[PDB]
Amino acid sequence: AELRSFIFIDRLQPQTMSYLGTWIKGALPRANMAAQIIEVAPGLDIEGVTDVALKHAEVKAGILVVERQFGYLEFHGETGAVKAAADAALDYLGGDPDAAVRPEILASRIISSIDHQHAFLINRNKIGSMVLPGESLFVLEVAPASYAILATNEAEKAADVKVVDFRMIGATGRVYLSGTEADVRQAADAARDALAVLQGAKLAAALEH
Amino acid sequence: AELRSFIFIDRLQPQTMSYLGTWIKGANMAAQIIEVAPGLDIEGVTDVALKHAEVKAGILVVERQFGYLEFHGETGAVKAAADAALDYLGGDPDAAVRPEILASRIISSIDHQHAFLINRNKIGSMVLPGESLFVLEVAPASYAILATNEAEKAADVKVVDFRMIGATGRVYLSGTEADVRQAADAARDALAVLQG
Amino acid sequence: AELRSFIFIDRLQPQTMSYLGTWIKGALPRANMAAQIIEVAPGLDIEGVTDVALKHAEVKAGILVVERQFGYLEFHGETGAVKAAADAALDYLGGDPDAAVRPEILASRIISSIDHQHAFLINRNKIGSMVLPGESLFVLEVAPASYAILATNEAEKAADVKVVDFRMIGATGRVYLSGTEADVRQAADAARDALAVLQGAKLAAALE
Amino acid sequence: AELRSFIFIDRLQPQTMSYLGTWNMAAQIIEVAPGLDIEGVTDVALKHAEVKAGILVVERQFGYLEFHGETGAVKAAADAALDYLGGDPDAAVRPEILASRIISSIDHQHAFLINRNKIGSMVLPGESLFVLEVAPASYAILATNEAEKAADVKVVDFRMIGATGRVYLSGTEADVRQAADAARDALAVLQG
Amino acid sequence: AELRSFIFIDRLQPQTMSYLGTWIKGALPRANMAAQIIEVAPGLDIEGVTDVALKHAEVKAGILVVERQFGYLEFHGETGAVKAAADAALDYLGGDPDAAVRPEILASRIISSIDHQHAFLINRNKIGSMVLPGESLFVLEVAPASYAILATNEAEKAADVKVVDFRMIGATGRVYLSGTEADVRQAADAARDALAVLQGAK
Amino acid sequence: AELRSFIFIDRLQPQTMSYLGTWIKGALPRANMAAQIIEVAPGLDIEGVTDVALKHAEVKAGILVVERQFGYLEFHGETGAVKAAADAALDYLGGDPDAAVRPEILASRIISSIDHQHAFLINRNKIGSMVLPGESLFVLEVAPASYAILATNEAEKAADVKVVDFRMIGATGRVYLSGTEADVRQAADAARDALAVL
Ligand SMILES: [Cl-]
Ligand SMILES: [Cl-]
């Protein structure tokens, strides 16, 4: 009924991958691997997607989740295999990647010089890297939620920031990044730019004529 | 306020009733499932049901949005408590939201990775690589119990996973492909009988 | 965005605070502190709120939570500090406390004499005190969910009841209170009236 | 093998019963070592059936079986288990009270720390508290049940599975003291 | 300090494999991969073992656990890679692959025809294959706990039994097998013999 | 029947503090906090200990648990208040601070460069900061368990390491520290010498 995301991660970054590895129930990715993430509604449709994907290439599935509303599949491996499995999944889902719901940024803020108590509270909630008092913190909320992994991975590509937390499953996705102010602003720019590439996908046709 | 389900089950099956915290002895156990919004309204329903007749409640839950009551026992007792609940809920069963099958699929011979992933999410019997799988999603969620009970009647399948509480309900059944096909048709027809 | 609640608790009550302390991960309040509760959508907006509130006065945050949809901040301390932090948070959120979504009661009911099996069933889900067979039970569902803490705290002020359950985070908030029928009806009346004064916030302008 | 416990509760009290819900009938509780021996016990006890087993656990070391329902059927199942074990209900390890204390008027901090640790009713700042630790653990149900039966107290916390069992009771100091006496005397055994 | 077990499994059986996949936090082993299991005390020693093991060969770790007292490592791979990793780890543990603590059967029973409620109770406790009323049930408790993996796997090799439940981490290990009564006893005595050949010393 | 530990911490460090539910109040060593940790057997004896301590001084109790066999209390605050509460606690137990069981280091190791999947496995086990592949690691196991907080606090004040995992409750305590090789080696020496002073 709804393709909420169809996300190719060309190369997973270390902190992003390490954070995934903290909670995902499936196969744990090797360094620098490509990955595909698919989110659908209704959630249970993802079971059929997973069946098709796994049986079309040698990919390792790290995520299979049917939450309250939506279903999620992630798989990774050699780039060739990931693309092949993704393409099979896509054909199963209508064959058009631009049918996917565009990401929306619901909230984004850079908090400069995080307060001591505030860092303590965040570090109690988060399962990734530690935020320090005085650091800057970037927070981003996106829907569909799965797009949080794209925002996070692209942020890490562009800046030496810490992945404090990111959630890519639910009604909305969340991204928490910390570091020096310049690094955090740079990382925030890259995360927003990554979503903008998707938001402006149909611009491609305008440029091809 | 809305009545999301008013489900009567004539004959509970072993795997299905296991989720309700009961089992069949030796020597017919009926059950009634009720789902409502707003969720806390189920407390008034429970108060009326459990008082009017003596039955055994396996479920009393208020989740994010919806409220759930299930009780079971001998047919007379169950139907007695159910009618008292119904009168409290307006006295008309047709007011209940009709079930909608959101997704349903037969997956022949599941991959070893797929089995692995399901087993790490499931509440039910371990699924093995190569087994055939039937998956089914329904809203309202509580209708999952009716589809699972009817499926269990019709075929020798194992209940791999089962959720009847939430925005949607879910059923994972495994077995040979022949049994799964039977289970699937029965589950689907069960959700079509309550439509008619 | 959306300011879902902006709630000031003048004096946190024992059970309310004890129940709160049961699950919260932030700092724990001592006897009869004041508290402020703020709920927003989108949830992640609460982080900026927290930054402002905690920088402007010496308060202790008990709750910093972003759930499925909404975000929650609770903090407490001496009265002056809580109000200072609260007004700072308020200025950040627009300056108008009446921009907050007014509480709606979705369900409320007193069960006069709870069945023994019913009492058992409730006790499996609840984290507060147990409801006992024969006792009266008040149940209340409110949206936005955070208003549950105000209903509960005010209930405890007005009557000697047991806080059986109290949920203030989610799509809807829930309150379960038990005890003698007299006490429970008294608590129920105070819980609803507390929500009523907020619902009638704009009557103030009419009266002055 | 080792019979650690063979306890009959004539009439379960509501708070004791309700606490078990997170898992006025008679009950039987049987603890054994090694733990997996409880499966043979359960197969013998429950083949009779007629009772409803609320607990079947094999923890780190010890095995637990609890079944309740109406009295006669419980005892019949209990006797069936008994014959299977050693066939005499006094080879069971008698309880040892490792620690027991009445704590007058709990501090507000103390209350909160207890409340986030425990399942069961809420202890409130100012209330008095009775605490008791016994081994074998399962005897905690006996002390707890007889305490609630004898006094007007809240079962704050209660654990009957593990190396040692625990009871937390709160209320007025007067009520807590009566519970304490009953809890301690319930664990009193004749031995000579 | 003590080596509590040093177990090589040539091929993991389907149900044993599927059951591991239900709880282990590492990589799932594929059908008929070799696997090595190492249990040690003190528990934290297993971190050093793990470091040496993963760095000497290309293996996949399925289990890394430091429980109340003991530490556990499991890794699987091609037989060659596994053996190389295990020999490295063994050398790191001094050597002598037989200095390991010998299995001790604390309890062993065939329940011939399990009754209804007992089945219901077991079914709500276990996370493996479901036991049916009337089936036979083999229960086996062993110390050190990690020997349960060897008993279970070998029992599944011997007869068509269902792996209801098995636990290989803790003070003691447990094995629950079900099926027809004939197959349960072959499985049981294969489980015992798998442990017995390790028990005995000359 | 047994005093397993009676630990005084002169000044708590931020990461160690977080496990006690507190933090450094602003950027000032003014509000530096001492803490006292007490572990006993039988576990339930800690409830009487807590009652005595909390009522003799203005301290903040951050830990109160009775596990399988042992009981744990921790409270922090100003140095004078902490010592006052501790002394009353000590008086209640027997008045002998040196009667506490001596800490034993069951295992300790520096792992120079964590393998990729090793970091995965640790991260899925830990309570603390995320460890990354390539980072160095110091692991330490100690009995009684509560002594882990002393080794961890001392390590933290001596080096720029991340507390990846920390357990101070159970049969044995555990601490995982990560960082550069230099930082981890300094933290190791400090943690070991902290348990050696005793
Ligand atoms: Cl809540
Ligand atoms: Cl327990």
Structure tokens at D85: 């074990």
d(C-alpha F50, C-alpha D113), whole Å = 10
Which residues from A are below 8 Å from E when comparing CB atoms?
27-28
Which pair of structure tokens corresponds to residue E145?
């706990």
- The tokens describing C63, both together, are 């709750």
Integer Rg of chain B from CA? 17
* Residues, chain E: 202
Please count the other Cβ atoms lying within 10 Å of the Cβ belonging to residue B105. Answer: 15
CATH number for the domain spanning F133: value is: 3.30.70.1710
Q: What's the structural domain count of chain B?
A: 2
Q: Give dist(CA C159, CA C148) in Å, integer.
A: 17
> Would you call D142 exposed, middle or buried from its count of C-beta atoms within 10 A (0-12, 13-18, 19+)?
buried
DSSP-derived secondary structure letter, A159: S
Size of chain D in residues: 192
* Cα–Cα distance, E130 to E176 (Å, whole number): 11
CB contact under 8 A, E21 and B115: yes
In this structure, are residues F174 and F122 in contact, taking their beta carbons and an 8 Å threshold? no
Structural domain including C89 reads 1-101
Q: What are the residues facing D58 on neighbouring strands?
A: D63
Q: Which residues of B22-47 are buried (b: 16+ CB within 10 A; e: fewer)?
A: bbbeeeebbbbbbbbbbbbbbbbbbb
The reply to whether B144 and B160 lie within a common domain is yes
Residue A53 CA, ligand 1 centroid: distance in Å:
39
Out of C52, C78, C101, a domain closes at C101
The answer, yes or no, to whether A and C have at least 3 beta-carbon pairs within 8 Å is: yes
Q: Are A123 and A198 within one domain?
A: yes
D89, D103: one domain: no
Dihedral angle of Cα A137, A143, A144, A145, to the nearest 10 degrees: 30
Ligand 1 centroid to Cα of residue C169, in Å, is 4
Nearest ligand to the CA atom of C16: 1
CA–CA dist D101, F47 (Å, integer) = 9
Phi-psi group of C68: left, alpha or beta (phi > 0 → left; psi -120 to 50 → alpha; rest → beta):
alpha
Ligand at shortest distance from the CA of D55? 2
Contact C116 D14 (CB under 8 A): yes
Distance (Å) from the C-alpha of residue E80 to the closest C-alpha of chain A? 21
Q: Which regions of chain A does DSSP assign to beta strands (E)?
A: 2-9, 34-41, 60-66, 71-77, 104-111, 136-143, 162-167, 173-179
CA atoms within 13 A on the CB side of D117: 23
How many beta carbons lie within 10 A of that of residue B79, not counting itself? 18
Give the N- to C-terminal CA distance of chain B in Å, as an integer. Answer: 24
- Elucidated via: X-ray
Residue B134, SS3 per DSSP: strand
Long-range CB contacts for residues E49-55, cutoff 8 Å, separation at least 24: E49/E73, E49/E89, E49/E92, E49/E93, E50/F118, E50/F121, E51/F111, E51/F114, E51/F115, E51/F118, E52/E88, E52/E89, E52/E92, E53/E85, E53/E86, E53/E88, E53/E89, E54/E85, E54/F115, E54/F117, E54/F118, E55/F115
Burial-class residue C58 by CB neighbours within 10 Å (0-12, 13-18, 19+). Answer: middle
Assess whether F93 and F130 both reside in one domain: no
- Give the Cα separation of F150 and F194 in Å (integer): 7
Instruction: Write out the two tokens for C199.
Output: 């619902």
Same domain? For E59 and E130 the reply is no
Count of CA atoms in the C-beta half-sphere (13 A) of C131: 32
Q: Give the three-state DSSP class for C203.
A: helix
Distance from the alpha carbon of residue D138 to the mean position of ligand 2, in angstroms: 8
Find the CB nearest B24 among E21, E116, E123.
E116
Q: Do chains B and A touch (3 or more CB pairs under 8 A)?
A: yes
C-alpha F134/C-alpha F114 separation (Å) is 5
Chain centroid, CA C75 distance in Å: 12
Query: Where do the H-state alpha helices sit in chain D?
Result: 14-20, 37-45, 71-85, 108-117, 140-150, 173-186
3-state secondary structure of D179: helix
Length of chain B: 196
For residues D178 and B63, what is the distance between their CA atoms, to the nearest angstrom? Answer: 40
Q: Kindly tell me the burial class for residue E132, based on how many C-beta atoms sit within 10 Å of its own C-beta (0-12, 13-18, 19 or more).
A: middle
B16: nearest Cα among B196, B108, B174, B150: B150
Q: Is there a single domain that holds both residue D74 and residue D128?
A: no
Q: CA of E89, closest CA in chain D: separation in Å?
A: 28
- CA B145, B148, B153 angle in degrees (round to 5)? 125
Shared-domain flag, residues E116 and E197: yes
Dist CA F39 CA F49 (whole Å)? 10
Q: How close is the Cα of E43 to the center of ligand 2, in Å?
A: 26
Q: Are residues F88 and F52 in the same domain?
A: yes
Q: Is the Cβ–Cβ distance between E85 and E51 less than 8 Å?
A: no
Interfacial residues of B (vs C; Cβ cutoff 8 Å): 38-41, 43-44, 46-47, 50-51, 56-57, 60-62, 64-65
Q: Cα D100 from chain centroid?
A: 15
Nearest by Cα to B138 from B102, B113, B162: B102
The CA distance from A99 to A202, in Å, is 11
- Determine the residue of chain C that is closest to A176 in CA distance: C44
CB-based contact A154:A195 (threshold 8 Å): no
CA distances from B154 to A25, B186, C37, C86 (A): 33, 6, 53, 62
Tokens 């109160």 correspond to: F64
Q: Which residues of C touch D (CB under 8 A)?
A: 14-15, 18-19, 21-23, 28, 30-31, 116, 119-121, 123-124, 127-130, 132-133, 162-163
CA gap B92, B89 in Å, rounded: 8
Q: What are the tokens at C31?
A: 């006897």
Contact status, residue A165 vs residue A22, Cβ threshold 8 Å: no
Helix (H) or strand (E) segment spanning residue A95: none
User: Omega of the bond prior to E133 within 30 degrees of 0, cis?
Assistant: no
Give the ranges where A163-209 is alpha helix by DSSP (H): 181-199, 203-207
Which residues are CB-neighbours of C203 under 8 A, at least 6 positions away? Answer: none
Q: Side chain identity at A96, as an amino acid letter?
A: D
Which of D66, D138, B47, D157 is closest to C130 using CA atoms?
Answer: D157
Q: What are phi and psi of F73, to 5 degrees?
A: -130, 135
Distance (Å, whole) CA C113 – CA C108: 16
**C-alpha distance from D119 to closest chain F C-alpha (Å):** 13
Tell whether B115 and B30 lie within a shared domain: no
Sheet of B169-175, strands arranged across: B100-107, B132-139, B169-175, B158-163
Provide the resolution (angstroms). Answer: 2.1
Task: Count the helix, strand and coil residues of chain D and give each as a percent rounded to the nearest 5.
Answer: 35, 30, 35
Say whether the A–D interface has 3 or more Cβ pairs within 8 Å.
Answer: no
Write phi, then psi, for D117 (nearest 5 degrees): -90, -30
Q: Which of A174, A127, A129 is nearest to A148 (CA)?
A: A174
Spatial contact of D62 and D136, defined as CB atoms under 8 Å apart: yes
Q: Mention every residue, 6+ apart, whose C-beta is less than 8 A from residue D122.
A: C15, C18, C19, C22, C128, C129, C162, C163, D115, D154, D156
Are residues B188 and B101 in contact, defined by beta-carbon separation less than 8 angstroms? yes
Residue after which a domain boundary falls, among E59, E77, E101: E101
A18 and F124 within 8 Å at the Cβ level: the answer is: no
Burial class of residue F98 (count of CB atoms within 10 Å of its CB; 0-12, 13-18, 19+): exposed
Ligand 2 centre and the CA of D159: distance in Å? Answer: 4
Instruction: Name the closest residue on chain B to residue E117, using Cα atoms.
Output: B23
| Number of residues that this document lists for chain F | 198
| Helical spans, DSSP H, in chain E | 14-21, 45-56, 79-92, 116-125, 148-158, 181-199
CA distances from C132 to B48, B173, C10, D12, D14 (A): 17, 40, 31, 14, 7
Q: How many CB contacts within 8 angstroms connect chain B with chain E?
A: 45
Q: What is the C-alpha separation between F76 and F58, in angstroms, rounded? A: 9
For residue C189, the SS3 value is helix
> Which residue, of B59, B77, B97, is where some domain finishes?
B97
**Contact predicate B120/A25, CB 8 Å:** yes
Rounded CA separation B171/B150 (Å): 12
Pick from E70, B184, E54: which is nearest to E62 by CA? Answer: E54
Residues D122 and D67 in one domain: no
CB-side exposure of F148: number of CA atoms within 13 Å? 30
- What dihedral angle (degrees, nearest 10) is formed by the CA atoms of A135, A141, A145, A147? -70
d(CA E103, CA C106) in angstroms, rounded, equals 61
Nearest residue on chain D to F72, alpha-carbon basis: D113
Closest CA to D95 of D150, D66, D138, D147: D138
Residue E159 C-alpha from the chain's centroid: 17
DSSP β-ladder status, D2-9 and D26-33: antiparallel
User: Could you tell me the distance, in angstroms and rounded to a whole number, from the CA of residue A154 to the centre of ligand 2?
Assistant: 48
The answer to whether the Cβ–Cβ distance between F44 and D166 falls below 8 Å is yes
User: Per the structure block, which two tokens stand in for C168?
Assistant: 């203030």
Alpha carbons B33 and B60: distance in angstroms, whole number: 10
Tell me, yes or no, whether B91 and B104 share the same domain.
Answer: no
- What is the dihedral sign for C-alpha D105, D109, D111, D114? negative
Do A175 and A195 belong to one domain? yes
Which pairs from E156-160 meet CB under 8 Å and 24+ separation? E156/E13, E156/E14, E156/E15, E156/E16, E156/E187, E157/E13, E157/E190, E158/E186, E158/E187, E158/E189, E158/E190, E158/E191, E159/E183, E159/E184, E159/E186, E159/E187, E159/E190
Instruction: At A91, list the tokens.
Output: 């054909």
How far is Cα C4 from Cα C37, in angstroms, rounded to an integer? 10
Dist. CA D21 → ligand 1 center (Å): 21
Phi and psi (nearest 5°) for C10?
-65, -40
Residues in chain C whose beta carbon is closer than 8 A to a beta carbon of chain A?
Answer: 1, 25-27, 42-45, 47-48, 50-51, 54-55, 60-61, 64-66, 68-69
| Helical ranges in F32-175 per DSSP H | 45-54, 79-93, 116-123, 148-158
